[PDB]
């Protein structure tokens, strides 16, 4: 059909289609009379996985010969999504596949919408990691993405009586045709026992013994016939584990749920020792076998010319201890040339400054749980506060800051100091949020080893995120400047050449409307919900977190729905408000803040006198396949968390190279951004990071905002008096005396700004010829956000590897 | 090589060596530098697979054009054993197989020891029912076997410092490559819950739900292209299940341990909740299942008519009440109607008369796991002694103690009686067993329904134990008579034509000969353990069990032993005794006696005045892939169950088929073999049963025989004083106490006649001609203990069906 979907050759066409029914005879067993959709994905995907196998043994063998240094991305989250569809793309099949299934009597589209997501991340931090396998593919990396093969991955999220509702990812059921397991590989794991210090080294003995059994699932590069392998690992018992019969077979129970279930925190810590079992579990096994493949290449001193590990925050942090004791008790190194080789091979990547979701384990836990890593973490320490000692001479309160080791009610590990004390670089995802790392929560160790900050500011894959999910936009850009721009993003910078084209400004007007009409069909689909396609989307989608303000949004809309009240037969520019997202599900406040937009909703939609003018939707079950939906189709991109607090964000830059505008707070990538398109071509408002500050040093007093302005109390007062709950007048009680006594992230003091920027907004939007001119400006200059970009810089500025552009004969 | 094995033909020897590294590269993901031998069987089991897909699919087919009446085989164990071998037999690509691999470099012999066994089964019992399926789908009848797919089946045995040391059979760690997860077709099952009486009906509600999915394994017959189907549930939790959070999900185990692992037990019952659910998960997922496809053919009056449903034991016997719940609260038939449909539909077998091992579940559970079941047992009772009241008036005692429910401490529902009355037939699974149920248990049963009573004497495949398991003797006789006696073994009377023929004697005594050097080097491979080729091998493999008595055999061989350090310089026919066989892990006596024998073995295998002319070797972990080696290299069977004690036994039929000669009493199937073969050609020795019952009504006084047999007296004072443990001198103090006080088997009452049998043993093994033509005279008569004639059998005499040996279009 269209031209960056690939070929669909005669040959080609006719090979998938019996390759197709070979699969579903042979694979899945079955007929064609007795065939159901599910049954056809299959066949489908299995035809597919097929082309990634010859590749995929090449690759590895590639690397096998060549042996160049490898990278090691490990995470204890891959937010993957849906694989079918972004293999194709990467393979060049789309169209083959597309001519081939048609010809079977089968819509391709459908079968897609039949495979789960692999939910296994939160949000962002998971996406980022899902983004930059497919970047090192791309880029010709020998990378590897290690994590845990989670059975059940974030939650699937159902809404009741406007209410969050919880329920399980049961996401394998079906199977994963995608993964191939190796058990052949299956590798050990300690924990609890004691150490005993003999004659020569200690040794960590009465230790219980996990499995750790890893799945690896391919990882195709852009068209340049890389495959790579992301290996994930799932917990088994050992056979003579708790070996009255019946109940210690059972028992296996206990050890198998270290991979059970993915932890649903966004940006907020839970110190449980199941969560500590999974971090380490991830770790130690990861280690082994990287070990094992650099042996298989006894001369350590190389080890860091070989290998390079990158943490994805402090989760996988025990890397570092785990190392020196390998390369210490097991390899018998001296603790200095262990410690070289160990702070040369690894880095760390801090992705938020928020003190609640920082790393403090408590050291009974580790003291119970891996005692030899707690002993390693003392000396650890002990020796890096020698350094800063002899750097900074008296300076006791630094001592104790900058310790690894934090005292008080309970003694705790401040795994972000042993992250930078064993790394040899730490980055920031964000110019700003780098800077804020610098100048505040890592100033001390700023100043002792400067020379280890960077920053690498985050990047979203734009296969993904915009060939995959914009397939309309790839084409009319492809036809202006061809299709080098999907590996080379930075080349859309010459579609400002466009900008003044009645052509190209009619047609990228025209892909976001059949964008928005495809997603209002979607709503009314699986969702049975009627909106209009002529309104402006207005859109928010995000985990739901407080420093993100979906609040802030709120009383925009309500904002909104009285001005219309007060002056019906007034005009204002029709607007279908759209938010979604997940709450933890012991997070509260997150939960009544979803309750408190389904009930805005309840009331601003049956409203006669509003009709079709406002719209306000709740976004069910937010997720990879969903964001790939929703974002092409819209117009207004909601990025509004308080300055200083969102580290970078990325659903900001999918909107971007989708055709959206953004309205935002001068955050995270959204300076970068604007600094990209030019601060005219972006709509700024709010308090930047020096006017928190200021705030926070007179001290914020919400009483003021509600006393002068007349709307904002207005809201309050309906909020208060139960105007959107009936029923249960001080439902929304915890909301409004948050706001009003207690809001860390200053909802009010953007309100004023926020409202009257929107209305510049909407001012904008009623000139669609100027409105599509500022979308050309955006995604023209959205190229710098291309996870190749961030990876590219990784690769030369840590990891110490070229990337390279070059086919691998397929 | 041989003929029995198939063609290998040049076309296919070619088609099977592609495929074979297609599946190694595309569906393995390896290739031959990095493939390891588990790898290769792997390519070689997709293969073979592959073969079975074509007729699987139109079989299926097949039976839904046609409508045959349909058999459903419920039982709660299936010994399956491997696949591989079995596969190829069937679809007669042995030979093929073997030169395609041998062509590609590979050992297939080698790839063949690979595969794990699937150990579902805990003996004859769950070895029955795949002997079963085998023959239903060799004689063309629509069966399908329906059970569940245990995680962990029979544990694997170790055997320690003498001691049997249980660890978890993890069968599934490597996959299945023989199953087809069917998840669409998953269905729920309900646990828990109250009833509810309403106007029209009683209602089950408020119930906790557990779904069932199944797993479908091929069942190939013997070169028809007949491919049925086994289905195997596994449990799941709904995923609103439980649904702090992280807790919910790992709760979901509670649920999924229904089909955690088998239950260990050999006759012997165990009233656990678990295992009642694990009973009702397999028959309420079965019968939804069974009611479904019938429906897919509202007139249950048909029903009988094209469903028969045989109860493997008393373990699925809540089918009964399951049906008539079905029938009468959901389908609203009457009563009456519903009572004569299950009747019809049902049929009953039975596998053991002793008391300790028949099903008595307490009400207490019932009511609390399944309130309407017990409802609906309660009603069937009542009606059945309103019948027994009206045959019999005035025998109130018959009326207790044929009601379902019996009196006394806790009242418990005798899973027996539910089974006779709602059945239409109940079979015993040999002539003496059957006639012992008329004449003792189920008297009162027999008295008020003999036309219920069948006989359906057991069979074992000739399939797996005579052609895949030894070659060497199907081809010898085949050579002579031809192959149609693999599928009608009736036709190897025709050997008796061959009795005299020195040629065929010569390859009778060649084939034996090297079957025991093979199993001698099998034993030196896997477990390093030196024996003589030369010498009888007197093996008895079977569950370890009292009532089997390897305690009397333990006492011939200690007999052996002191007649030899008696007379050193004396000849004696040298013998290799073999002993194997698991002990259900609570079942104290049955570990001792493991002990014993590992005990005796430590002082005969390294007393030097013995030499090599007496070995005893316990065989570790018996299991099926261990039968198929062991049986063929045997020269006598020991089969010395205590008369009335072993149903049937099959065993001794596996022993008979491959060349062993019998020493055993008058038991179970012992009796018919002895009949067929003639008394001349067995060794039979012991009490009968009519012996055993006048002891026990003079009573059983074990010292009478310590006091009049000097040489049992030495073997009890060598026991007691710590002969047989030095360090432990009363270790077996409980073994002596037990054969001693209270020992319900008698075998001080069979010690005399069985020492003065096994010397006719011995001097007919002196005879190597006479051996060999007693042996050809049991092979020879060993036709009618086929299961081909067994399920013939019970196709017309109780489900109605006529067997077919036609061929299916491939
Ligand atoms: O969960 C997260 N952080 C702490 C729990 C470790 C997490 O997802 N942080 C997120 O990481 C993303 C990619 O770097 C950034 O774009 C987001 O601004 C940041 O919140
Ligand atoms: O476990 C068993 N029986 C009771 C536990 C139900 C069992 O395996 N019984 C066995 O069934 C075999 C086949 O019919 C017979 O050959 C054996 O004699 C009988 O013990
Ligand atoms: C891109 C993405 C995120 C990150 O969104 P932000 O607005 O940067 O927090 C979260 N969830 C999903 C499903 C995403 O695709
Ligand atoms: C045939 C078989 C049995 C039954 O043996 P009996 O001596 O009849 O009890 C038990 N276990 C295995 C592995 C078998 O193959």
Redesign the pocket.
Known sequence: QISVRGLAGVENVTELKKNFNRHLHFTLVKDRNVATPRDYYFALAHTVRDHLVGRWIRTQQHYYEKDPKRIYYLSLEFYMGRTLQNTMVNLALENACDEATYQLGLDMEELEEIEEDAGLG?????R?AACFLDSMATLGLAAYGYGIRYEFGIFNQKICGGWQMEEADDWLRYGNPWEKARPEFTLPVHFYGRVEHTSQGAKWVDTQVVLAMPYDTPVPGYRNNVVNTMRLWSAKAPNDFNLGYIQAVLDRNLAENISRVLYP????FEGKELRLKQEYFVVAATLQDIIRRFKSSTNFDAFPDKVAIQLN?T?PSLAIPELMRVLVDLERLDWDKAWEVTVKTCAYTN??VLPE?LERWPVHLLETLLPRHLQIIYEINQRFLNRVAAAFPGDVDRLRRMSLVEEGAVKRINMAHLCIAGSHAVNG?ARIHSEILKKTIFKDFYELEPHKFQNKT?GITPRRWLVLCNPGLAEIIAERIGEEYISDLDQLRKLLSYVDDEAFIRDVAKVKQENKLKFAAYLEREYKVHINPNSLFDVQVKRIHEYKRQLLNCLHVITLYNRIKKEPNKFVVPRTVMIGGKAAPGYHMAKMIIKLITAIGDVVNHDPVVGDRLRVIFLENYRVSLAEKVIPAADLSEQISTAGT?????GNMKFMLNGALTIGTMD?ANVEMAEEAGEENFFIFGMRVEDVDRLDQRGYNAQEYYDRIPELRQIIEQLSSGFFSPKQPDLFKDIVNMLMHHDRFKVFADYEEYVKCQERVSALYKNPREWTRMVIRNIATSGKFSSDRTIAQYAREIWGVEPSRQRLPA
Request: glycine share 22%; hydrophobic share 25%; charged share 15%.
């Open positions: 939160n949000g962002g931090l998971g980022l925190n966004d940006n907020f925050d989760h992705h938020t979701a995802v985050n969102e580290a970078s964000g990325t995270g």
